[PDB]
């Protein structure tokens, strides 16, 4: 060529091998680090967990002996997951150009940890994978609205309904959309109701940390916190493999990258974690 | 390279129940459809039924296969009565289905005779344990996904 | 698209750049100016080089 | 015109003959240099350059690799008639450009049976064929820009 894909020509103009970086990751969605984390070993997951408990009740008259109880416990089964991204490279180029080699691989551990965000939490089944927490959980409490109530209200609104509820709260598991949106709809004031806007209150709110995480959908909050209600146990962890002697790279100059992960999800309280959807 | 088998990703269509023999009626003693046998939903295995054949593990929840092959137990191996299911797991409706136990045609999974144990694939294969009792037709080998009538 | 299969369709992570050539670029202006007139006012001159500067 | 090259900029000072294919005609128009997907804040200067070897390696997108002698095989030759300047810079765009090869009659190099090879960037080169070639084996009534079905 004349050049490699350049605007102008390099015969006319403009010499260099050196280049910056151009590669930027785009919508981070962890909660990994943020949960506690265990060996397994195993090729399927069984979980038990309790349910509530058959004691006896008096609503009227109390002299007589509650019925007794025994533990309860309901079933889950967990199959492995696998979660993985894939590169194809160009040798000549990532030498040449310099950055892209160090960028590969930090881009893949995020999108390693992206992608299983989004399996635990629901991105769509096949029945091979990983189960579907946010479906089971807790439905939407209409009791948090008090009707015609602001969307950032209804953040804060909730955050305390779930220390009503006795479940710990340290932190507000929301989506992307839906924090930007409860940031704009505020009240008449330049002020915002979790603090004002001369503080710093992009990554917090209701003075509890922001967990962005992506496939909780759009109007819809979800407190927790995320140590408490699952667990992630690890399979195989992340690890890159390269290969140059898988069939098509090898005929070519091409190498592949992969990054990959097995995983597999523990539910330690999948019969309680609160969430709402405004109604507002 | 690669191909899926069980799990969701095979296709065995649909066949009717209400084909073959006496058919009962409409009652209770039944159990409930969910894709794991003792799972939780979009979570089982699934041989190489459609419609006829599933096992509770634990609960009394149904989708195909898994439980002890030496005895088998419960009344039959379980018939749905006048709902014709419309999954390819065996049974995964996602209803509280009223079941049967009058002669009806059933789907089986898994190579030789059911005499054996579990293969957590969602099929039966021959164990230790043999001349233990077996489903459906008799005299009569059997392979994986053969027609049965009980 | 996301993981729903391990080996029949997986996602990618992949990320693509292109390298454009950037040529050195000048930025200038000239301002004409006669001796006399700019010897007589006498600010002139400074007034005329600070004012080319910022107005580049 | 002339020398025009833009400034509104009409000639380009360079003709590229668009050779329609034989038995049902072909056509293949000029590719853009591109690394995988399409090119942001515009998309540059053609990959192919009149009087050069290159080979496609994406859809809508050429670049380098060069045919190696031995055995005949195809055309990925995209020869086009050299233009007048510009013949050691390649070929800018805003000038025209096409893609002459692969179903269709193509535009050749060498005069006689006597050829060598090209540089990419529109030069001409003596070489015999012993690591690398380019264009069809030669045929009677061979000129530059002659019309070889390959």
Same mark, same amino acid.
């Not at chain 1, 260099?16 to 990994?32: K, P, Y």
């Not at chain 1, 939407?140 to 109530?149: G, L, R």
């Not at chain 2, 799990?7 to 209400?18: K, P, R, T, V």
């Given at each position: ?133 946010? #479906? ?136 309680? #974690? ?7 | ?150």
């Amino acid at each position: 060529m004349s050049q490699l894909s350049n605007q102008e020509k390099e015969y006319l103009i403009s010499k260099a091998l050196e280049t910056e970086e151009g590669r930027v990751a785009l919508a981070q969605a962890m909660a990994n680090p943020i949960r506690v984390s265990l060996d397994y070993q195993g090729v399927g997951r069984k979980l038990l967990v309790v349910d509530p408990l058959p004691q006896g009740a008096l609503p009227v008259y109390d002299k007589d002996v509650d019925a007794k109880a025994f533990v309860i416990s309901k079933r889950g089964q967990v199959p492995d997951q696998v979660i993985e991204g894939d590169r194809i490279q160009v040798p000549t180029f990532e030498i040449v150009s310099y950055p892209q080699v160090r960028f590969s691989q930090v881009k893949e551990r995020r999108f390693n940890v992206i992608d299983r965000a989004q399996q635990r939490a629901k991105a769509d089944i096949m029945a091979v994978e990983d189960a579907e927490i946010f #479906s089971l959980l807790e439905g939407a409490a209409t009791a948090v609205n008090a009707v015609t109530i602001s969307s950032g209200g209804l953040q804060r609104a909730a955050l305390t309904k779930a220390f009503q509820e006795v479940e710990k709260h340290d932190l507000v598991v929301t989506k992307i959309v839906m924090n930007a949106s409860a940031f704009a709809d505020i009240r008449a004031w330049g002020q915002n109701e979790f603090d004002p806007v001369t503080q710093h209150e992009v990554l917090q709110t209701g003075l509890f940390g922001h967990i962005w995480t992506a496939d909780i959908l759009i109007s819809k909050k979800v407190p927790q916190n995320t140590v408490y209600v699952l667990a992630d146990p690890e399979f195989v962890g992340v690890m890159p493999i390269r290969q140059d002697i898988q069939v098509i790279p090898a005929d070519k100059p091409e190498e592949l990258r992969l990054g990959w992960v097995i995983y597999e999800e523990l539910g330690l309280a999948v019969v309680n #974690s609160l969430a709402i959807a405004k109604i507002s | 390279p690669y191909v899926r088998l069980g799990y969701e990703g095979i296709l065995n269509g649909a066949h009717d129940i209400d084909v073959a023999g006496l058919n009962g009626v409409e009652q209770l003693a039944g159990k409930f459809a969910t894709i794991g046998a003792n799972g939780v939903k979009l979570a089982g295995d699934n041989g190489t039924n459609a419609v006829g054949l599933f096992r509770e593990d634990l609960g009394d929840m149904v989708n195909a296969s898994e439980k002890a092959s030496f005895y088998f137990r419960g009344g039959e191996y379980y018939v749905n009565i006048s709902r014709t299911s419309l999954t390819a797991a065996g049974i995964a409706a996602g209803d509280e289905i009223t079941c049967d136990a009058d002669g009806k045609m059933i789907k089986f999974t898994g190579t030789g005779k059911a005499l054996g144990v579990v293969t957590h694939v969602g099929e039966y294969r021959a164990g230790n344990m043999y001349e233990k009792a077996t489903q459906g037709v008799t005299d009569t080998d059997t392979f994986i996904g053969f027609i049965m009538y009980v």
